[PDB]
Amino acid sequence: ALLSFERKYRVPGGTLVGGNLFDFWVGPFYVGFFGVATFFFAALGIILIAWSAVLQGTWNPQLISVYPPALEYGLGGAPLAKGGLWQIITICATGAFVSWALREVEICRKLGIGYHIPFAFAFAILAYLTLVLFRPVMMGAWGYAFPYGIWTHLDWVSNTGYTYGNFHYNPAHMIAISFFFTNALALALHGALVLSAANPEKGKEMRTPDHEDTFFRDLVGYSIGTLGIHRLGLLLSLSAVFFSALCMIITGTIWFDQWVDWWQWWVKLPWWANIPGGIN
Amino acid sequence: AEYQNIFSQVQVRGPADLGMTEDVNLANRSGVGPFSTLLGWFGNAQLGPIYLGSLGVLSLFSGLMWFFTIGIWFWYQAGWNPAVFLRDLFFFSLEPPAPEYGLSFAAPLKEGGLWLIASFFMFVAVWSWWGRTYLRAQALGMGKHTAWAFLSAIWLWMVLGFIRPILMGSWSEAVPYGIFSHLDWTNNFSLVHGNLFYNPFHGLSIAFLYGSALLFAMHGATILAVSRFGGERELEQIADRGTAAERAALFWRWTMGFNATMEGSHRWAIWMAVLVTLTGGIGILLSGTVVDNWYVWGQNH
Amino acid sequence: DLASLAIYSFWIFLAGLIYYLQTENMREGYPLENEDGTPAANQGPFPLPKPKTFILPHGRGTLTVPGPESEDRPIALARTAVSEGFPHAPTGDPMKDGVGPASWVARRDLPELDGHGHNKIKPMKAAAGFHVSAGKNPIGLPVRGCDLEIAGKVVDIWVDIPEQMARFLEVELKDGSTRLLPMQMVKVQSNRVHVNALSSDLFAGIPTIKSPTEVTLLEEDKICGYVAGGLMYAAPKR
Numbered sequence A: 001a002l003l004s005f006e007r008k009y010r011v012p013g014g015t016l017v018g019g020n021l022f023d024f025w026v027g028p029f030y031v032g033f034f035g036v037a038t039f040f041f042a043a044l045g046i047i048l049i050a051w052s053a054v055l056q057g058t059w060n061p062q063l064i065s066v067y068p069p070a071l072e073y074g075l076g077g078a079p080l081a082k083g084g085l086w087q088i089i090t091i092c093a094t095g096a097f098v099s100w101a102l103r104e105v106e107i108c109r110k111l112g113i114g115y116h117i118p119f120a121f122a123f124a125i126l127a128y129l130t131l132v133l134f135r136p137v138m139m140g141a142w143g144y145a146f147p148y149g150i151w152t153h154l155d156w157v158s159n160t161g162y163t164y165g166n167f168h169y170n171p172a173h174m175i176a177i178s179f180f181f182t183n184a185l186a187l188a189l190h191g192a193l194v195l196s197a198a199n200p201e202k203g204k205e206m207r208t209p210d211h212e213d214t215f216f217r218d219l220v221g222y223s224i225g226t227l228g229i230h231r232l233g234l235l236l237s238l239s240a241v242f243f244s245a246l247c248m249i250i251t252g253t254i255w256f257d258q259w260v261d262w263w264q265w266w267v268k269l270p271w272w273a274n275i276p277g278g279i280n
Numbered sequence B: 001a002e003y004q005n006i007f008s009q010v011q012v013r014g015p016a017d018l019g020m021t022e023d024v025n026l027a028n029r030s031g032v033g034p035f036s037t038l039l040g041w042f043g044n045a046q047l048g049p050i051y052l053g054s055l056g057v058l059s060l061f062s063g064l065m066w067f068f069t070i071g072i073w074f075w076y077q078a079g080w081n082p083a084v085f086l087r088d089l090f091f092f093s094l095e096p097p098a099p100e101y102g103l104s105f106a107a108p109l110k111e112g113g114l115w116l117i118a119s120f121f122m123f124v125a126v127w128s129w130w131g132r133t134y135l136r137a138q139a140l141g142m143g144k145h146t147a148w149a150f151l152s153a154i155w156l157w158m159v160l161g162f163i164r165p166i167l168m169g170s171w172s173e174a175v176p177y178g179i180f181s182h183l184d185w186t187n188n189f190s191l192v193h194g195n196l197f198y199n200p201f202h203g204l205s206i207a208f209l210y211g212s213a214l215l216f217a218m219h220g221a222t223i224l225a226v227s228r229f230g231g232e233r234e235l236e237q238i239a240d241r242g243t244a245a246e247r248a249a250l251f252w253r254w255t256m257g258f259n260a261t262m263e264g265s266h267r268w269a270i271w272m273a274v275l276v277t278l279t280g281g282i283g284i285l286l287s288g289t290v291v292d293n294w295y296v297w298g299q300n301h
Numbered sequence C: 001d002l003a004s005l006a007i008y009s010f011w012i013f014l015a016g017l018i019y020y021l022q023t024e025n026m027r028e029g030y031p032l033e034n035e036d037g038t039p040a041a042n043q044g045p046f047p048l049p050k051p052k053t054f055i056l057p058h059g060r061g062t063l064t065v066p067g068p069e070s071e072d073r074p075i076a077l078a079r080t081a082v083s084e085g086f087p088h089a090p091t092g093d094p095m096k097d098g099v100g101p102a103s104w105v106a107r108r109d110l111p112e113l114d115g116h117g118h119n120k121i122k123p124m125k126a127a128a129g130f131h132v133s134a135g136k137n138p139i140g141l142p143v144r145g146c147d148l149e150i151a152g153k154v155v156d157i158w159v160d161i162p163e164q165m166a167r168f169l170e171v172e173l174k175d176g177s178t179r180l181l182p183m184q185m186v187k188v189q190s191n192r193v194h195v196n197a198l199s200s201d202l203f204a205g206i207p208t209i210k211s212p213t214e215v216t217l218l219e220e221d222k223i224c225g226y227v228a229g230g231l232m233y234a235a236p237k238r
């Protein structure tokens, strides 16, 4: 039921809504008001999916899929079986994500820590909302949103990208990929540093942050520092998801032609446009 | 405005830190570089010293010999004209030898031999640097984690440029050196193999790539949230658990019903990231050597 | 077929990895306990790992985990409900008693040492060559708590020597005694330092340190503990 040092923290207080009404745990799990919110929204959502299942016709998870209203419905409702179930599941998902965060805030207040986790989570929620609400709204239809199925959402990724040619040429999608890759770089590095300090050569004693700084300076002439690295992971992470939302918010809205062609602005600059030679 | 530990409010500076001496040969460490106040708001202000032994110079040199090779070629392709160079920078490309030459080193300089030269320079740059990775750690008596993890990155790179081209019988199968062209290469590789979305190793690899952003967001945020109890002093929190590590475990355990240890979290971390390139490289390595078409392969697993 | 051999092997290797990882992460806080300290019945499907031993570097000893677990300290709370899973009410003043978000751990009563075996953290005044290099120097600023009353004045900064970073402000009280505030819980502005966690009357309550030129891990916990706790517990006076 409890970790060996847990009791002293399990105190009353922290809640954002309802005072002591939902102030309790179930096994390891805290339970906000927002614990109840997330259960309700999630369970409803799941039921609606087990359901949308039987109306499309399966009980197999690689097949089950739930599509948004088709393009013709615009921004309006749609019969349950013809995409409104999706509309409602979306409301339910948003329901559960935002609650999960707010629940996180409550756990933070109880533990007396900072809000950095739920804040970070919020960037993920905003990426999702970009795909299922902000992009589709600015575009006229729930039909541009992606559908809920393990393999079908990949179909969507692929149709949406190839509609603009090779999606690589989306410049914001380029910044975003840099961030993902750099993040995974920093994550491998961070993990291996700390671990190579705590599990040194063998029979040898634990190294120190000075060793960690020293190792990095030896290797590359610089070392960000144990505070820095954690400031950096966070930034690299969130930046990646930020530019992800940017690269799709702008696609189908301010830019809708072949992304490759956008680069023509650079090459067509007066001082070098007409000069001959090179690739162009 | 409750404060967040994202930027330092006050920087503090002391005598330059020349670092720990362990079995390191101090003869090869430079002297300290300058102190960047800019850097200093976010992390450490100190630049250097850097250690540059013989293997370091080798790496830094062939490395520098990998980047002028591509660059003279890019400059040729520009017809020596500097405004063209800038204009067409992302367009230039150093392509490998055509399929006719298989694995032969014969192909003319201007039409594939330069590719091989740059590739050669790159090969010795990367492996010598890998050595550097292990050796700086040995001299410090530290574990070999960094080198093992770096090996995982090397795997993908090895497989794309070297192992896969060999197994497929030609250098034409390898990746060009250009910004746009390596992107084209990538899209085309997918098209020709029946769409990498059907490659289960591609999926795994995405899973860990996204997973890395998830974990590092979690981790970074967690450490910053308990930085009011010294949480970033992770090594000592490993040796003698404080309230920082307790309050962090317990946010996760109240949130999602299970948690990490200060040390453990770093194991999740090293593995999450490493598995991106581990799975990725396998997936590429099997493409065209064993599976011509992931769709097709998928229809039978 | 070789590629379905590869993917099958991988799922197996990945299951073994999650196993290794999850058990690695049980070297603290396990075995699980009931709210009263006794070993719980459902320990979960993962067994504890075989012990490992870190060698500590400055004659400072060993750590071996998993190992016998204990708070090594009284926990002034009592149950508020008749079954598992509810809050435990503070039986006293929770700030004073070190519970809730005012909790501290019974870490070692010595200081963290750098790689050279010196104290990791010193007040700047005894840190050779150390000075503020950028941003508003807090030293001499009045310190203001959340009641908007002045609780004292900054008299130095304690610095992490090897990482060259501010870790605490040393603050003086009407008294003439000082306390450490954690650097991360203060806002340095141009005419004051603002502390939202604590109200002017709670400063004297901040746990004090035994020597004026060093802090032990145990003392850092009590201090950090205490000021974070004020965000919940000073909220009436805020």
Ligand code: BCL
Pocket: A097, A124, A125, A126, A127, A128, A130, A131, A156, A157, A158, A160, A161, A162, A166, A167, A168, A173, A176, A177, A241, A243, A244, A245, A246, A247, A248, B186, B187
């Ligand atoms: C053929 C396809 C096209 C292409 C078309 C697209 C399209 C189309 C899109 C991307 C997007 C992305 N592409 Mg691209 N892309 C291509 C090639 C690449 C390559 C490559 C190596 O070549 C890379 C590295 C990338 C990388 C990327 C990223 C920048 C981004 C995906 C991450 C993201 O947004 O997450 C943010 C994270 C989320 C959205 C997840 C949100 C999680 C929510 C909040 C909570 C979920 C809770 C869950 C339900 C609970 C389950 C229960 C528990 C598990 C128990 N693309 C090719 C050229 N790419 C996407 C993007 O930018 O999105 C904004 C996008 O739409």
Ligand code: BCL
Pocket: A046, A128, A131, A146, A150, A151, A153, A154, A157, B197, B202, B203, B204, B206, B207, B208, B210, B211, B214
């Ligand atoms: C981000 C840009 C694109 C996108 C592009 C891709 C691509 C490209 C790929 C995936 C893949 C995945 N995507 Mg997707 N995906 C998108 C948005 C989502 C959303 C969402 C709520 O926004 C979810 C929940 C998922 C979920 C998934 C998983 C089924 C799979 C592995 C993800 C992962 O490990 O991430 C990191 C997260 C973790 C490691 C945490 C664990 C999360 C678990 C595994 C998610 C379980 C979801 C469950 C199956 C569905 C929820 C049902 C519940 C009962 C309600 N994607 C958008 C539309 N996604 C990969 C795949 O292999 O698909 C077959 C793949 O190649």
Ligand code: BCL
Pocket: A157, A181, A184, B126, B153, B154, B156, B157, B160, B185, B186, B187, B189, B190, B195, B196, B197, B201, B202, B205, B206, B207, B209, B276, B277, B279, B280, B281, B283, B284
């Ligand atoms: C249309 C394009 C295709 C596609 C084709 C490919 C191809 C082809 C490949 C990938 C690969 C990947 N793709 Mg895919 N990809 C697509 C769609 C996606 C989508 C999506 C639809 O949203 C996503 C999220 C991804 C994501 C990914 C990554 C998980 C994976 C690369 C891992 C990595 O870290 O690489 C980056 C890491 C490296 C390149 C290793 C770098 C190591 C070397 C040693 C560094 C040398 C540095 C050198 C010295 C120069 C540096 C200079 C310095 C400043 C000093 N792809 C579509 C279907 N994708 C790779 C993979 O593994 O596939 C299975 C790959 O080969």
Ligand SMILES: CC[C@H]1c2cc3[nH]c4c(c3C)C(=O)[C@H](C(=O)OC)c4c3nc(cc4[nH]c(cc(n2)[C@@H]1C)c(C(C)=O)c4C)[C@@H](C)[C@@H]3CCC(=O)OC/C=C(\C)CCC[C@@H](C)CCC[C@@H](C)CCCC(C)C
Pocket: A038, A041, A042, A045, A046, A089, A092, A093, A094, A096, A097, A100, A104, A117, A118, A120, A121, A122, A123, A124, A147, A148, A149, A150, A153, A237, A238, A241, B210, B211, B213, B214, B217, B218, B221, B255, B256
């Ligand atoms: C912003 C940086 C990155 C990030 C950060 C991040 N994620 C987070 C957090 C943070 C900081 C948490 O605190 C939180 C957490 O608790 O993690 C363990 C979380 C989380 N991120 C998660 C997943 C996730 N994050 C992703 C990505 C990212 N997360 C970014 C890369 C992805 C990707 C890349 O695909 C996924 C899949 C969860 C593990 C967790 C949130 C758990 C949660 O909100 O629980 C509430 C809801 C449910 C338990 C039930 C399901 C909801 C129902 C309404 C039905 C299903 C909806 C439908 C959309 C299904 C879609 C089907 C798919 C096939 C497409």
Ligand SMILES: [Fe+3]
Pocket: A190, A194, A230, B219, B223, B234, B266
């Ligand atoms: Fe860490």
